[PDB]
Design a protein around this ligand. Structure first.
Ligand code: SF4
Ligand code: SF4
Ligand code: SF4
Ligand code: SF4
Ligand code: SF4
Ligand code: SF4
Ligand code: FES
Ligand SMILES: [Ca+2]
Lengths: 145, 571, 905, 145
């Protein structure tokens, strides 16, 4: 998980970082400066995690590319309503115990931490109205409210 | 807690009263989606329970329905007593505005129930039909003969081992049936019909020729002493078709019951299927369904008033319905979860042109009805009954409200958002003759035009199909574009939608009274049981008890005054 | 164990996983990657339930029900909102890349993915991005490949590799571009590749033969039948549409063929749909062929039979028990001859004597998978009884199963089992004239002539028990390998000896009986399996009768002047010149057959019999199991002039017209009662299936699904008036959907599996008592005989070793799953899969002949010189020449014969 | 005077073509199973390029109740009910309309829809990945991770 400047005073232990919403991990921390857009960073992370999937289990194999495509759309300014909630549901349903191994929980940890802290950049990615269906001429669409 | 939630209705006061009277172990309360407390009674306590319900402080006064069910192939019978067959009794209390369904379980080797003709006289025809179609005997019945099939019929067609489809035609049996129809007047035996004192010897037996049916008449000169109407000439086996079509593909058959109704007959079926499916439809669906049902009710009422005493008004309605649905008589347009299409661009223009042109026609109809002294001399005072006679015979609709009993389904038990529309219910005096019924139908025509004005004026914007996964079929543009919608459409039009196993019920105010669909799902893609209660059945059974001592012309006028069709009677 | 699902208490097996336990209770949990026969892996992540620590736990945790044991005091929720949400999410993630293909997909209406998409409640797409796509492969004539529809559930590779043992199907690639197929374009090599069309829950692997004449599942007319393509008797669901046989689906039988067929029985049904079949009785008058109806054909045949002095009847192992018995009644018991040769009959009756008198219990096909050691003697099991080869593979994997059970690893956790038992497997010892397809898992393979295989069997029996006759001249290295076999067979708890009549040696069967008797003498739980040649070979053996040679002798000597040939072409059991001369000598030949055979040119009357699709009957397994097969469709429903009756119906009416000069189209149960009255050893066939009066609460059993389409249009081009529904007086089934096919109905004959919400072959879970067990009220079929109380004696006729003599060439039989069977090789889709006619030679013999690989040599057998191209076989022994049995010009009766004048053409 | 029929009017049934001029029917048999009367009968054939089409197609119009459920069930919009009611016949056998009596030369009421532009199955003129919302097939031997 990403952590903020307020978390910088925590001792690098398993228990202290675990109580902060992250894991100590390999203890090799990486510093993100203010010039780095969080949506592009998380897009890079999810692109890595999606293409390093082994393909065995459905949530990682077919739910990390969905997050990658959403983050590419938000990075291009082509996001649509539903995208951030789809990212949050992908974070929820790729957690521990939902996938075969721990590649996908660790994959979606930066995503949920970035949506939790830097939600403004993700929300600024959304610019288009939602549409995944073209008009068929003789058929009147069912206008769901 | 939606309206379609499975309930047991243990908070109903009838359950506490029955428990305090008969003991807690006397009956089994079943959880259904019928909206009704369904209790299973022992066969030996059945007349006692019926007599107890008849004498409550707000008594159950009307036997709404009585029929059978073949429970042999029903697998999901959890929480139910062991039954090979069952007989259900739907009883309606109007003062309480409640109803109860008693169920009697029967083994295959002992198919006989005590009769209700000493409590509710419409049980006569109901028990005759239950005997004809299921083979269940009712002990004490005055004449338990076949009512739907001919008397020389082998087997009981609503049993689960009886094949639904048509057997091979034979000219052999055809010429036998022709030769017994030629010799029927020569060999008329007046106890194969329930008659008595057959040839006094001044009495004459004739047969008379809204559908074609026979009625045997017993005459003292020109006075009617007794009559029995011979029905079943219009029997189509619609309930059997309910057991042999998918839930989606049974809709045209629902149209062809009460053929003047159209969408009015469509409505209770899709409402009961949506109760089975756990579907709540949006407001645009509710308003579309109300608008189409009121258009067809206006059409049926205009035909009834024109018959009793025209072509332009029904033509305008038929063009509007043809533009919306693609068909005039049997639109087949209501769907499970919504309607088949959205409203066409230009529906409001046609409805506004129909509503701006109708009130002057209504004023003309009221002039031709309430100012016609020849009609006011020919019609009133003849074939008249009060509230007590209408309640005990299951009379609904214009006759019941013409007896002064303020009972309409659209107000007492609202459905499809009828409580959002402001409309009045006309109720007459204490006398239900031809004249009062006709003026009640005229006032209902006025109120239906009010409902149509409210449908036109504030029509909701939104979907014409529900968001539910069981909406059959799904919206066509998503079907043609999206693979999961294509999958749902594929399996919903081929194998059929799977309704989870439950029992549902919906009663509506049809054009001729109260029409109800009682649907039993065994968890499959077809109906396990489709019970259709139609008002023309109960209205036709009241004909012998209403013209005792009238003349044959008075019988003809009475037949004209009752709004009925033979498809509604026989289904 | 005790589990609580959504607050309801259930009693289950604690050794099962929660998915199979909950499916056995009728609860619906969506699943893709789990199969009852393949075990649990946890790939698809679809079967999520919510587990709680105890009764007073509310938060829970999503667990995967196929990887969770159904232990005692378990608390799960299927209908939890989070579990339902996650299962819908898994379906959604699968749907993100799935092609918009359902109208043009052969799996539609039969698709497990369609069913689970509907069941999870997912019908709204919110994915707007692109779908991944894949190129397709060419997998041969039987399987059609469409990788777009794949959901990466790994069932195909798990089945084809871990279960069927095939080697040319795999998974390639990575993250979301995983590809399931062959490493290159080409035909799938496994004999059980056809079961991929039912293992795969999507439309990736589909029946190409059915795709040629596709119809949806709701449009089929199904019947429960028995596969006719060898002796194993696998239960099938043949389904027809518009008067032609369309598909062979697997019919679940927890005792025989549970989930799987072989490719021969699945794809060699196409002889039924041939357009040159007899469809009407035809009488030869001069050079004219007069078409008759049933009545005048019976009258003319009866008059000719009455004016003749002796009438003989030649049956077949193709025909049912009822048909062979009807011929036996028509011609007389002493005049009835089995249509097989004398040597084939001798081997068949020895196999029957070993089965029903040897005192060793013969296992069912399912029970073969529980034996601890397997010795296969002479029988090429993969090419003649293929499902026995698959069951042998499972029994071989039993060792890894035992090793994993020793470490307290559950039986469904197949990956842990395969990891613990790395390459350890139960001992398998096969013998053949060359290499087999079981050599990859065989602990030892012996390539030798049939005499030397029999001698190895006799030596194994002598080393197991010294009372068995000894074999002299065993080489020290062969004696060491015999000692290896003896140490493996003696230490096994459950040894199994498999042999059969296809090896062409009586002594191989005697040696197998000797090994089984020696193992039984040591107290071992030994079983013996015999592979017969045809579908009703053991039934024809139990019925008995003279050989084909005796019938030809009667015809040639003139003692018989009328011959009735039932479902026999007579060229696969005798020489064609002798058969042709003997049938040309007879003044009446009457062939009751459903296929245009070569003996119909000499025939004076041809009765258009019905095949298994157009007829009812009983056939006897290779293990002695009587099984009923029911008629699929009425042949006369579309073509009104088709007179294609059951063979026993023809023969019973011919007998009645010979006796009392009136036709009598009887009923099937009358013929069955006649069989069980006249032949007491066939009395078990009465209980094979119930009679025609059997009802489920008063209604017959439905042959076609309840949503059957086209009722008032499928025959409208012939006549707009709808004909009468065909009447089935013979069986409890009706030729309509006005009937019962409920999964909870008290029957054992299920025409097809369908439940509301389960339109796929996964609907079989509803028809079973526990999933992967038996059918809910028992499997169909009945064993004719029990295990005898007393055994046989040791066979002391030990043959001498094979001596390769100059000029002669011992014909070594090679069998092919596609080509050795007669009717299946007539099916037009098999000619692509058929091997080319190749005569196999040793390198030494071919070098002596001056012949290399591919050049054509000519040899004369029975005065007939034929030419075949030479294939070099290293595994063959010198002095032997390899021939493919059952192909064109090579009768299976040549197995063991000698050859003359093998020279280059 | 001629009778006016609205565009939704449920009359004589036709099989239509796509904008390319080929018949829209893929012989999926959904219309036949959705027919409550069972008066549709057809058979699937395939072209050399793998295009599914009806080998024959027949409608028993003496049985047909003109309910429009087949058109509603068609997922290619091939089968349509057109505003035409003049179908009286001398013989009932002539009321069985074969494919030559049903296949019109145009798209009917739906002027643009093409099911084979949306299906993933490869036909002639549409290779793999050339349909709507479909990426090009990535070869499994690709150098990219
Ligand atoms: S979470 Fe692990 S097991 Fe699942 S696909 Fe990803 S890398 Fe493979
Ligand atoms: S595999 Fe199933 S869901 Fe996919 S296209 Fe075929 S029928 Fe449709
Ligand atoms: S090809 Fe079929 S069985 Fe194999 S992984 Fe894909 S969907 Fe599963
Ligand atoms: S093993 Fe034999 S009986 Fe079974 S499917 Fe194959 S050919 Fe048929
Ligand atoms: S309109 Fe209705 S009855 Fe006519 S072919 Fe179509 S589905 Fe069948
Ligand atoms: S539903 Fe449409 S595409 Fe499918 S078979 Fe019928 S007309 Fe053809
Ligand atoms: S069935 Fe359990 S995860 Fe696939
Ligand atoms: Ca038969």
């Amino acid at each position: 998980d990403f952590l903020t400047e307020a978390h910088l005073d925590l001792p690098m232990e398993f228990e202290s970082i675990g109580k902060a919403g992250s894991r100590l991990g390999t203890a090799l921390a990486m510093a993100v400066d203010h010039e780095i857009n969080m949506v592009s960073l998380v897009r890079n992370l999810e692109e890595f995690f999606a293409r390093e999937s082994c393909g065995w289990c459905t949530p990682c194999r077919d739910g990390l590319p969905w997050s990658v495509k959403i983050l590419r759309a938000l990075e291009r300014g082509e996001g649509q309503p539903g995208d951030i909630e789809t990212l949050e549901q992908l974070c929820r349903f790729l957690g521990p115990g939902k996938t075969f191994c721990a590649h996908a929980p660790g994959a979606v940890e930066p995503l949920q931490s970035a949506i939790k802290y830097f939600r403004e950049e993700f929300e600024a990615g959304i610019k288009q109205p939602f549409s995944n269906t073209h008009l068929i001429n003789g058929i009147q669409p069912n206008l769901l409210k | 807690e939606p309206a379609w939630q499975t309930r047991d209705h243990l908070d109903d006061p009838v359950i506490g009263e029955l428990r305090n009277r008969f003991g807690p172990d006397a009956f089994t309360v079943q959880a259904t989606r019928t909206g009704v407390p369904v209790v299973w009674i022992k066969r030996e306590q059945l007349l006692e329970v019926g007599d107890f319900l008849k004498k409550l402080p707000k008594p159950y006064v009307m036997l709404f329905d009585l029929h059978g069910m073949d429970e042999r192939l029903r697998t999901h019978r959890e929480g139910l007593p062991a039954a090979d067959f069952s007989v259900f009794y739907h009883l309606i209390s109007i003062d309480r505005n409640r109803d109860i369904m008693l169920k009697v379980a029967l083994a295959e080797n002992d198919l006989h129930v005590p009769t209700f003709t000493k409590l509710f006289p419409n049980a006569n025809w109901y028990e005759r039909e239950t005997w004809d179609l299921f083979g269940i005997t009712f002990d004490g019945h005055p004449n338990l003969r076949r009512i739907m099939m001919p008397q020389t019929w082998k087997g009981h067609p609503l049993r689960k081992d009886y094949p639904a489809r048509a057997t091979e035609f034979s000219p052999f049996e055809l010429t036998k049936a022709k030769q017994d129809l030629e010799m029927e007047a020569l060999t008329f035996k007046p106890e194969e019909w329930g008659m008595k004192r057959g040839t006094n010897e001044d009495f004459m037996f004739l047969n008379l020729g809204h559908g074609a049916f026979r009625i045997v008449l017993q005459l003292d000169g020109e006075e009617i002493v007794d009559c029995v109407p011979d029905i079943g000439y219009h029997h189509r086996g619609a309930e059997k078709m309910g057991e042999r079509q998918s839930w989606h593909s049974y809709i045209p058959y629902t149209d062809r019951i009460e053929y003047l109704g159209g969408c009015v007959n469509e409505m209770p079926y899709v409402l009961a299927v949506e109760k089975l499916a756990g579907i709540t439809v949006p407001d645009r669906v509710n308003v579309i369904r109300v608008m189409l049902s009121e258009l067809f009710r206006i059409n049926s009422h205009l035909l009834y008033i024109s018959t009793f005493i025209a072509f332009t008004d029904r033509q305008k309605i038929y063009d509007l319905v043809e533009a919306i649905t693609g068909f005039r008589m049997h639109p087949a347009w209501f769907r499970i979860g919504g309607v088949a299409h959205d409203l066409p661009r230009g529906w409001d223009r046609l409805l506004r042109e129909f509503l701006d042109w109708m009130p002057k026609r209504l004023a003309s109809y009221e002039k031709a009805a309430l100012q016609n002294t020849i009609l006011k001399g020919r019609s009133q005072g003849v074939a008249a009954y009060g509230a007590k006679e209408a309640l005990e015979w299951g009379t609904t609709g214009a006759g019941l409200r013409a007896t002064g009993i303020d009972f309409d389904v659209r107000k007492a038990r609202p459905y499809s958002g009828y409580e959002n529309f402001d409309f009045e219910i006309p109720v007459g005096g204490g006398v239900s003759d031809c004249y009062t019924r006709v003026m009640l139908k005229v006032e209902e025509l006025r109120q239906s035009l009010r409902i149509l004005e409210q449908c036109l004026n504030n029509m909701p914007e939104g979907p014409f199909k529900a968001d539910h996964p069981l909406t059959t079929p799904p919206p066509k543009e998503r079907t043609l574009q999206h693979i999961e919608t294509l999958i749902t459409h594929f399996l919903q039009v081929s194998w059929g939608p799977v309704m989870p196993a439950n029992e549902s019920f919906q009663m509506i105010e049809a054009t001729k009274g109260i029409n109800s669909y009682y649907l039993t799902s065994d968890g499959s893609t077809m109906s396990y049981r489709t019970r259709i209660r139609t008002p023309s059945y109960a209205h036709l059974q009241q004909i012998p008890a209403a013209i005792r001592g009238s003349l044959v012309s008075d019988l003809i006028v009475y037949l004209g005054s009752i709004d009925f069709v033979m498809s509604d009677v026989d289904r | 164990a005790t589990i609580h699902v959504d607050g309801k208490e259930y009693e289950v097996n604690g050794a099962d996983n929660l998915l199979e336990a909950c499916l056995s209770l009728g609860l619906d949990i969506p699943y893709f990657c789990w199969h009852p026969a393949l075990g649990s892996v946890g790939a698809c992540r679809q079967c999520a339930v919510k587990q709680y620590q105890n009764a007073e736990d509310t938060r829970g945790r999503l667990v995967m029900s196929c990887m969770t044991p159904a232990s005692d005091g378990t608390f799960i929720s299927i209908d939890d909102e989070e579990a339902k949400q996650f299962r819908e999410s898994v379906v959604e993630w699968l749907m993100t890349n799935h092609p918009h293909d359902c109208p043009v997909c052969e799996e539609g209406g039969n698709c497990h993915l369609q069913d689970m998409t509907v069941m999870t409640g997912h019908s709204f797409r919110r994915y707007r991005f692109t779908k991944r796509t894949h190129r397709n492969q060419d997998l041969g004539p039987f399987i059609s490949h469409e990788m777009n529809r794949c959901i990466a559930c790994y069932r195909c590779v798990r089945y084809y590799k871990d279960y069927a043992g095939g080697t040319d199907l795999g998974v390639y690639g990575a993250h979301d571009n995983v590809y399931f197929g062959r490493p290159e374009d080409g035909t799938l090599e496994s004999e059980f590749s056809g079961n991929l069309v039912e293992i795969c829950p999507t439309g990736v692997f589909t029946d190409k033969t059915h795709s040629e004449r596709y119809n949806r599942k709701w449009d089929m007319q199904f019947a429960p039948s028995i596969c006719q393509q060898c002796s194993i008797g696998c239960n099938i669901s043949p389904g027809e549409r518009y008067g032609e046989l369309r598909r062979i689906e697997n019919r679940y039988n927890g005792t025989v063929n549970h989930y799987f067929l072989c490719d021969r029985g699945r794809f060699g049904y196409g002889y039924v749909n041939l357009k040159d079949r007899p469809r009407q009785p035809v009488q030869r008058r001069g050079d004219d062929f007069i078409t008759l109806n049933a009545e005048q054909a019976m009258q003319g045949a009866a008059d000719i039979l009455r004016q003749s002095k002796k009438v003989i009847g030649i049956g077949s192992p193709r025909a049912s028990v009822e048909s062979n018995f009807a011929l036996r009644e028509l011609v007389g018991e002493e005049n009835f001859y089995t249509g097989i040769a004398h040597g084939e009959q001798e081997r068949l009756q020895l196999a029957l004597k070993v089965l029903r008198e040897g005192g060793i219990y013969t296992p069912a096909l399912r029970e073969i998978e529980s034996y601890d050691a397997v010795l296969v003697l002479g029988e090429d099991v993969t090419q003649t009884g293929a499902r026995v080869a698959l069951a042998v593979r499972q029994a071989v994997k039993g060792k890894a199963r035992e090793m994993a059970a020793a470490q307290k690893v559950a039986d469904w956790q197949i990956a842990a089992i395969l990891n613990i038992g790395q390459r350890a497997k139960h001992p398998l010892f096969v013998t053949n004239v060359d290499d087999t397809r079981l050599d990859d898992i065989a602990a030892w393979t012996y390539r030798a002539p049939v005499e030397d295989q029999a001698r190895l069997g006799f030596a194994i029996a002598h080393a197991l028990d010294n009372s068995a006759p000894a074999v002299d001249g065993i080489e020290p290295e062969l004696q060491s390998k015999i000692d290896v076999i003896v140490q493996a067979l003696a230490g096994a708890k459950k040894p199994l000896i498999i042999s059969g009549t296809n090896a062409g040696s009586l002594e191989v069967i005697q040696a197998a009986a000797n090994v089984a008797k020696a193992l039984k003498g040591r107290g071992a739980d030994v079983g013996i399996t015999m592979i017969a040649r045809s579908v009703n070979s053991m039934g024809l053996g139990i019925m008995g009768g003279g050989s084909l040679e005796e019938a030809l002798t009667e015809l040639e000597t003139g003692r018989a002047d009328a011959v009735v040939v039932l479902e026999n072409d007579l060229h696969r059991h005798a020489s064609a010149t002798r058969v042709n001369a003997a049938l040309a000598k007879a003044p009446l030949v009457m062939v009751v057959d459903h296929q245009r055979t070569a003996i119909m040119e000499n025939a004076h009357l041809v009765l258009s019999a019905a095949s298994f699709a157009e007829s009812d009957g009983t056939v006897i397994n290779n293990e002695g199991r009587a099984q009923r097969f029911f008629q699929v469709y009425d042949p006369a429903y579309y073509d009104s002039k088709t007179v294609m009756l059951e063979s026993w119906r023809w023969l019973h009416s011919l007998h009645s017209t010979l006796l009392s000069r009136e036709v009598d189209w009887t009923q099937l149960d009358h013929v069955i009662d006649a069989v069980v009255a006249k032949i007491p050893e066939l009395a078990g066939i009465k209980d094979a299936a119930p009679d025609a009066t059997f009802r489920i609460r008063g209604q017959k059993l439905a042959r076609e699904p309840h949503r059957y389409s086209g009722r008032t249009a499928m025959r409208a081009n012939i006549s707009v008036h709808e004909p009468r529904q065909p009447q089935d007086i013979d069986t409890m089934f009706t030729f309509s959907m006005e009937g019962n096919n409920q999964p909870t109905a008290h029957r054992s004959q299920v025409p097809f599996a369908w439940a509301p919400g389960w339109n796929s072959p996964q609907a079989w879970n509803k028809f079973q008592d526990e999933v992967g067990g038996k059918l809910r009220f028992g499997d169909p079929g009945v064993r004719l005989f029990e295990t005898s109380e007393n055994g046989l004696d040791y066979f002391t006729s030990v043959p001498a070793r094979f001596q390769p003599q100059d000029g002669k060439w011992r014909i070594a039989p090679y069998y092919h799953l596609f080509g050795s069977d007669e009717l299946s090789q007539r099916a037009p889709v098999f000619q692509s899969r058929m091997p080319q006619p190749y005569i196999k030679l040793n390198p030494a013999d071919a070098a002596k002949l001056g012949v290399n690989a591919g050049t054509r040599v000519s040899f004369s057998y029975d005065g007939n010189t034929v030419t075949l191209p030479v294939e070099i076989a290293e595994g063959l022994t010198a002095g032997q020449v390899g021939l493919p049995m059952g192909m064109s010009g090579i009768a299976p009766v040549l197995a063991g014969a000698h050859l003359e004048d093998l020279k280059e053409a | 005077e001629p009778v006016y029929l609205p565009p939704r009017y449920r009359g004589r049934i036709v099989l239509t073509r796509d904008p390319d001029g080929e018949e829209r029917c893929v012989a999926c048999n959904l219309c036949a199973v959705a027919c409550p009367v069972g008066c549709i009968s057809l058979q699937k054939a395939e072209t050399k390029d793998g295009r599914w089409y009806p080998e024959f197609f027949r409608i028993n119009f003496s049985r047909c109740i003109f309910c429009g459920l087949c058109e509603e069930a068609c997922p290619t919009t091939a089968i349509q009910l057109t505003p035409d009611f003049e179908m009286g016949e001398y013989k009932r056998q002539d009321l069985v309309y074969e494919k030559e009596d049903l296949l019109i030369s145009g798209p009917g009421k739906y002027p643009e829809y093409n099911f084979y532009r949306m299906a993933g199955m490869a036909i002639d003129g549409k290779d793999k990945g050339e349909a709507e919302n479909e990426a090009k097939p990535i070869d499994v031997k690709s150098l990219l991770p």
